[PDB]
């Protein structure tokens, strides 16, 4: 019995940042995350 | 409170402005406790690393939620 | 019969091919004679833009599942089915020992770096009677040392076996045939940063921690034999140049040696501390 | 230049700054000089010593 | 930015005003028309250009170099 | 049609292979040679041409029988038309589903 | 321009569209397809009986398309076949399958 | 001249915008193809026709 | 003026007015398959590599890359890249003097040009290094411009 | 070795190659480029 | 032999022989001898009739 081995930590860090780097979210879902828009202070 | 995992190994906080030039993401691990048990049936004979977990910026765990504004100069971070 | 082509000009033939290209209007040009060659040159960069067979090689497979417009028993048969055309491979070996250091690399954040070498040399042997067996593990555990040792970071045997238990023997051996396997199919410095790096010092020591495993090595004091130990007893003495609270208790606790080399380390270098005043 | 001005930023507003101009007719033109593009008979040379000491 | 050397459309002197601007208004507590205005600038073109600039480099200059 | 359209050939019997240009090998640093969803919807029902030839080949387990058949018509269906109602959509190994050629023709954008 | 051929050149009058007899389909087939691994698979050019092989048209416009010669910019592709152990449905089809059968008896087929 | 009438004048907020014309500027005569249909590229910063 | 257009003071353009910068980065990285294959930032040659593009070189640096500052125009090759060419492998024509090296370097965008800003070398997250270039040019109002 | 910088200590590294991705004075991790000596005459037209 | 840069100029002169020359990277040839029948790509100059739209 080996804990490591156990938990793979990917299962969360690799879910979470995919459904971020694309709005993605599951699919089922899209147009979530956006990269943000640094035009001018108020865009 | 954030940091990241350097390919040799080494591990370290990380600051909002080198993430955006690593690359990298601006994350923070969890830690959860774990009870391993066992019972034979009807009796019974540390801390969990799960993941890294991104942040929002100006959170309580982000480490610009309290710092000063001009250090934000020295964090070289638009106030 | 070779199939080829070789590019040439018809009004020159003067040489082998000097001539230029003109991707962004699409044509070879007789870069010497002014005459153009070929034509309707198609993209050749926007084509990859898009989007393991290094180790995988030739064959190929896809990854599927159930759809929108589906029920659950189409997704139960091409759940079972697609568990069906595996054991056409062994590659169900070649892939999980992947799979298993997918997780593996993972689980000690190994970078995609060492995965892959540490995948790759696995697609080099993956067998032989000489290996026959040999625990499907202690490979997997030399599989990624290899890697390591070629991602250039290198790990402790202790390390990886205190990532997996593996008797350290047969693999020891496992490891020593598999580097002559490579040898055939063709440093002790390293560790200091990551040691400290829990130890959360500054680079001064590891530094100078550097120099002093780099004066001991080669003057004499042939210095550890399982030297890893006198790495250490460099952190211990590059920390006895400082002041800062290093126990060698606290050293041998997290960095698992016994301090009586680290006397003993220290012991010659409490005698070889005087050649070793750079600073 | 070390400063926080893109460099012909500052060489712009270095265009905007007037110069005494009495004695311009004793200068001819910069095209009009067979120089070597530049000399004291078309044209006037400045430099800048700026340090954020 | 950097108080713009002359003004757009009339051209006059502004690299000057700039810091005499300034030491008016600390110093004299004193309001905006009459401030320009003793600095000789009676068009508006440029009662535009000072009385709208932004000085910003002084926020550039904050940053450690 | 006798001469043009059989019934007979409503029922594909044997599938001709378009050829390389019209299913490309997108071909990107020496490595990164890429190929289009018509590329393995050949492979697959290629393999699902020959596993099901050998189960009939060797052995005759007379329900799986009907299975690799099931399976390849299936595919083939796929291979002819990705968007089919009341079906799964046969995705690929990136998860989107596969680009059919129907769908090279489907609509705004298609060939036509 | 494109290289000389004597062929006397003719525009289009007439489009019949129709099915091929899988006699025609082999008939004209240059090739048989075996072997989905792809290319050669020593990690040289090219498979042969394979999802792409040679005998078909030819790419990297250093090839030559063995059949019909070299110019990428004119081999018009030739075709491989692939035979079916079991005849399958043709999907766009089905419909009429199921409104062909109606029409018959399953038994004389008349 | 004078002028025969009277013209509104003030200052006023302007703003600029992206959409500069060194940004939509391009022609093409005989540029790359698709590798799929030989068609011309599209895409402008790609010599799109 | 007619239809939504303007007439714009040429003089105050020269004053500066509506001016404004122009801010492009570039990015790259090496990265490899067995290690077997290593992509390599370096100075390319016509003498030695193959597939080789049209613009220059000679502003590169022998480590691949151009100091700041340094002018530029569209088709300069701004960071020198290359790939591992197996001989056998392809046979494309000229191989038979190189056998070295593919190139694989990022041009400036042929229709862009100005001056090299701001160069920085890292690893990415995963210890390959990776260089990013900044572009800067000025963008003075022109007749199409959009105000 | 070719004069780079580090963003936390400013300092002429002033490096070669096979070197650890590191300066001077402050652990620092990333460098620049370090901008030519040589001049670049100006059209500033 | 104005080359293709300076406006008045041309980019491709076409031989009868389905051959085709670029200007530029031919101006080591220099003037070449035209002949009739060959043909040649000027730049667009005045009075061209050309097609122009504007989408949709
Ligand atoms: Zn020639
Ligand atoms: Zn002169
Ligand atoms: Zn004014
Ligand atoms: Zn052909
Ligand atoms: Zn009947
Ligand atoms: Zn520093």
Not at chain 7, 74 to 97: R, T
């Amino acid at each position: 019995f080996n804990m490591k081995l156990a938990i793979n930590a990917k299962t969360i860090t690799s879910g979470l940042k995919y459904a971020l780097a694309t709005g993605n979210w599951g699919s089922s879902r899209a147009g979530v995350s956006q990269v943000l828009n640094r035009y001018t202070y108020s865009s | 409170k954030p940091m990241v995992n350097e390919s040799d190994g080494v591990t370290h906080a990380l600051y909002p402005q080198e993430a955006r030039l690593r690359n990298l993401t601006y994350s923070s691990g969890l830690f959860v406790d774990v009870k391993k048990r066992t019972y034979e049936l009807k009796y019974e004979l540390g801390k969990v690393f799960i993941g890294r977990l991104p942040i929002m910026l100006r959170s309580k765990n982000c480490y610009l939620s309290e710092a000063t504004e001009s250090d934000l100069y020295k964090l070289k971070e638009c106030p | 019969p070779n199939l080829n082509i070789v590019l040439t000009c018809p009004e020159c033939k003067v040489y082998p091919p000097k001539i230029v290209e003109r991707f962004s209007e699409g044509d070879v040009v007789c870069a010497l004679c002014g005459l153009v060659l070929s034509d309707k040159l198609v993209d050749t960069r926007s084509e990859w833009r898009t989007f393991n067979p290094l180790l995988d090689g030739n064959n190929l497979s896809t990854r599927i599942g159930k759809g929108e417009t589906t029920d659950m028993r189409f997704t139960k048969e091409l759940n079972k089915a697609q568990g069906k055309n595996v054991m056409d491979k062994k590659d169900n070996e070649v892939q999980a020992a992947f799979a298993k250091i997918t997780m593996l690399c993972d689980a000690a954040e190994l970078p995609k770096i060492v995965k892959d070498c540490a995948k790759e040399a696995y697609k080099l042997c993956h067998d032989e009677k000489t290996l026959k067996g040999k625990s499907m593990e202690s490979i997997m555990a030399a599989s990624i040392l290899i890697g390591c040792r070629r991602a250039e970071v290198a790990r402790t045997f202790k390390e990886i076996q205190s990532l997996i238990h593996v008797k350290t023997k047969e693999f020891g051996k496992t490891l020593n045939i598999m580097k002559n396997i490579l040898r055939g199919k063709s440093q002790n410095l390293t560790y200091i940063p990551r040691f400290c790096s829990h130890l959360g010092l500054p680079m001064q020591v590891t530094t100078s921690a550097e120099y002093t495993a780099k004066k001991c090595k080669e003057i004499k004091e042939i210095a550890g034999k399982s030297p890893i130990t006198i790495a250490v007893v460099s952190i211990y003495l590059n920390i006895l140049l400082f002041q800062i609270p290093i126990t060698a208790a606290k050293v041998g606790q997290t960095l698992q040696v016994t301090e009586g080399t680290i006397k003993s380390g220290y012991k010659i270098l409490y005698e070889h501390r005087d050649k070793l005043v750079d600073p | 230049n070390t400063t926080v001005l893109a460099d012909e930023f500052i060489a712009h507003r270095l265009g905007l700054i007037p110069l005494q101009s009495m004695d311009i007719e004793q200068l001819e033109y910069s095209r009009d000089c067979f120089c070597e593009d530049h000399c004291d008979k078309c044209s006037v040379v400045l430099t800048l010593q700026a340090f954020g000491e | 930015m950097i108080v713009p050397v002359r003004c757009f459309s009339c051209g006059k002197v502004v690299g000057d005003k700039w810091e005499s601007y300034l030491n008016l208004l600390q110093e004299d507590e004193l309001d905006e028309g009459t401030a320009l205005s003793r600095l000789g600038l009676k068009r508006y073109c440029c009662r535009r250009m000072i009385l709208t600039h932004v000085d910003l480099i002084e926020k550039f200059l904050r940053y450690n170099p | 049609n006798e001469v043009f359209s059989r019934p007979e050939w409503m029922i594909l019997t044997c599938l001709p292979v378009p050829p390389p240009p019209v299913r490309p090998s997108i071909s990107f640093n020496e490595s990164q040679r890429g190929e289009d969803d018509l590329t393995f919807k050949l492979a697959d029902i290629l393999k699902a041409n020959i596993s099901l030839e050998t189960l009939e080949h060797n052995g005759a387990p007379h329900h799986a029988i009907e299975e690799a058949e099931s399976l390849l018509q299936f595919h083939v269906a796929t291979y002819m038309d990705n968007d089919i109602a009341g079906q799964p959509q046969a995705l690929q190994k990136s998860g989107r589903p596969v680009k059919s050629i129907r769908a090279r023709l489907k609509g705004k954008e298609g060939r036509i | 321009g494109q290289q000389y051929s004597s062929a006397p050149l003719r525009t289009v009058k007439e489009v019949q569209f129709g099915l091929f007899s899988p006699e025609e389909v082999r008939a004209i087939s240059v090739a048989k397809i075996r072997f989905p691994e792809t290319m050669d698979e020593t990690q040289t050019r090219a498979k042969i009986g394979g999802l792409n092989d040679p005998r078909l048209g030819s790419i990297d416009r250093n090839l030559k398309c063995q059949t019909c010669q070299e110019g990428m910019n004119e081999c018009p592709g030739h075709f491989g076949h692939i035979d079916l152990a079991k005849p399958v449905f043709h999907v766009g089809f089905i419909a009429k399958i199921k409104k062909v059968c109606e029409c018959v008896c399953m038994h004389c087929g008349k | 001249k004078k002028l025969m009438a009277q013209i509104f004048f003030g200052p006023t907020y302007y703003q600029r915008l992206r959409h500069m014309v060194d940004d939509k500027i391009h022609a093409r005569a005989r540029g790359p193809m698709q590798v799929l249909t030989r068609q011309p590229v599209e895409g402008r910063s790609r010599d799109g026709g | 003026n007619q239809e939504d257009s303007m007439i714009m003071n040429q003089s105050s353009i020269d004053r500066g007015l509506f001016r404004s910068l122009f801010f492009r980065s570039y990015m790259d990285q090496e990265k490899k398959y067995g290690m077997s294959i290593t992509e390599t930032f370096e100075k390319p040659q016509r003498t030695n590599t193959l597939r080789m593009k049209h613009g220059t070189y000679d502003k590169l640096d022998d480590d691949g890359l151009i100091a700041p500052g340094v002018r530029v125009s569209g088709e300069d090759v701004i960071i020198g890249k290359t790939t591992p060419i197996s001989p056998d492998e392809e046979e494309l024509g000229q191989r038979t003097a190189y056998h070295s090296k593919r190139d694989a370097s990022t041009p400036l965008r042929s229709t862009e040009n100005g001056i090299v800003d701001q160069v920085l070398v890292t690893t990415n997250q995963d210890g390959l290094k990776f260089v990013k270039v900044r572009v800067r040019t000025t963008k003075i109002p022109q007749i199409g411009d959009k105000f | 070795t070719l004069k780079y910088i580090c963003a936390e200590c400013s300092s002429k590294l002033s490096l070669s190659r096979t070197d650890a991705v590191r300066c001077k004075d402050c652990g620092h991790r990333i460098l620049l480029k370090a901008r030519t000596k040589r001049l670049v005459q100006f059209e500033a037209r | 032999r104005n080359g293709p840069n300076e406006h008045p100029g041309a980019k491709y002169v076409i031989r009868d022989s389905g051959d085709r020359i670029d200007l530029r990277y031919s101006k080591r040839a220099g003037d070449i001898q035209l002949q009739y029948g060959w043909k040649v790509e000027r730049h667009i100059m005045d009075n061209d009739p050309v097609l122009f739209n504007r989408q949709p």
